[PDB]
């Protein structure tokens, strides 16, 4: 941030800004992650391979990191992101959880995300049956009705009648 025009180019600075971009994915700051992609437009251009790995990961993330997570994990054995790739493994996305699974789907290993990776072994079971079922809130996935299945009713007409009182009275209130 410091204007410091005299500040020299730093090899540590370029990679760490890229590490920060990966860190934003770890804390799930998606709006910030694009803000960081914006933060270094000249770095992003085409080079800055350290910066490139998180931007490629961002393309994978909107695509769904689960499909390309194996490619992302093996994309660089070491880019100075060795601790950061461990954080990337920590930030493996489990947002695919809102779907039928266990017996109804049985295996979600096809997507290749670490949480749903492995067809049925105890390592898969540990992620799959964590807190009973993955995250653990909601109905058990094995007997889950696809999802929460909340639905809706036309009983709201009485509630809509209450809404009607407020809007209609106002039109009269204006006179």
């Amino acid at each position: 941030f410091d204007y410091k025009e005299q500040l020299p180019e730093s090899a540590y600075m370029h990679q760490l800004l890229g590490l920060n971009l990966l860190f934003l994915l770890s804390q799930n700051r998606v709006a910030e992650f694009h803000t960081e992609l914006e933060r270094l437009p000249a770095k992003d251009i085409q080079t800055n391979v350290y910066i490139k790995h998180p931007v490629s990961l961002e393309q994978y993330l909107m695509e769904g990191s689960y499909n390309k997570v194996f490619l992302a994990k093996g994309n660089i054995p070491a880019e100075s992101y060795t601790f950061f790739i461990d954080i990337l493994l920590d930030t493996i996305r489990d947002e695919i959880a809102g779907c039928i699974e266990k017996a109804y789907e049985k295996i979600l290993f096809t997507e290749a995300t670490r949480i749903l990776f492995f067809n049925t072994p105890k390592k898969m079971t540990d992620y799959a049956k964590k807190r009973g079922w993955v995250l653990g809130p909601n109905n058990y996935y094995s007997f889950a009705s696809q999802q929460q299945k909340p639905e809706d009713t036309t009983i709201p007409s009485t509630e809509l009648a209450k809404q009607v009182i407020e809007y209609a009275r106002q039109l009269e209130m204006i006179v």
């Binding site: 007409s157 009485t158 009648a161 209450k162 009607v164 009182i165 209609a168 039109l171």
Partner: protein, 146 residues
């Protein structure tokens, strides 16, 4: 239409018929003035002002028996409503569609010399009251009953 009259004596004619100690009451008496037929036979008589006697509870009972009774005030059931309303709303709107052509004429007209343009067709208040009161039946639908 009722009016009250008291005769004036011919002997009293030489004297002032009605000396006034109060100007405002004479002014109130002046407001009725005289009727042309009464004027023809006014001589030998003097009109006397008539006012309603004070009415309190008497006014109150008729007042209670006006909107509640003389006018429709069932109140328990005071509140057609959805049967012929659709016909009335369509008919008034149709009259407006023809009537609004006169305002369209005024805006297009240069009207350098002021001319009547049949504006103030209105009916907007009539449509507003009818649609809103019928829409207020929602209170009967879900609140007054269940």
């Amino acid at each position: 239409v009722i009016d009250a009259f008291r005769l004036i004596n011919a002997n009293m004619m030489v004297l002032g018929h009605e000396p006034r100690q109060t100007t405002s009451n004479l002014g109130h008496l002046n407001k009725p003035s005289i009727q042309a037929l009464i004027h023809g036979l006014n001589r030998h008589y003097y009109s006397i002002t008539i006012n309603y006697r004070k009415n309190e509870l008497e006014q109150k009972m008729l007042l209670n028996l006006h909107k509640k009774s003389w006018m429709e005030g069932l109140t328990l059931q005071d509140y057609v409503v959805k049967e012929m309303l659709e016909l009335a709303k369509n008919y008034n709107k149709a009259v407006e569609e023809e009537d609004k052509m006169t305002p369209e004429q005024l805006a297009i007209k240069n009207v350098g010399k002021q001319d009547p343009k049949r504006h103030l067709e209105e009916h907007v208040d009539v449509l507003m009251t009818s649609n809103i009161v019928q829409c207020l039946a929602a209170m009967l639908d879900t609140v007054v009953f269940k």
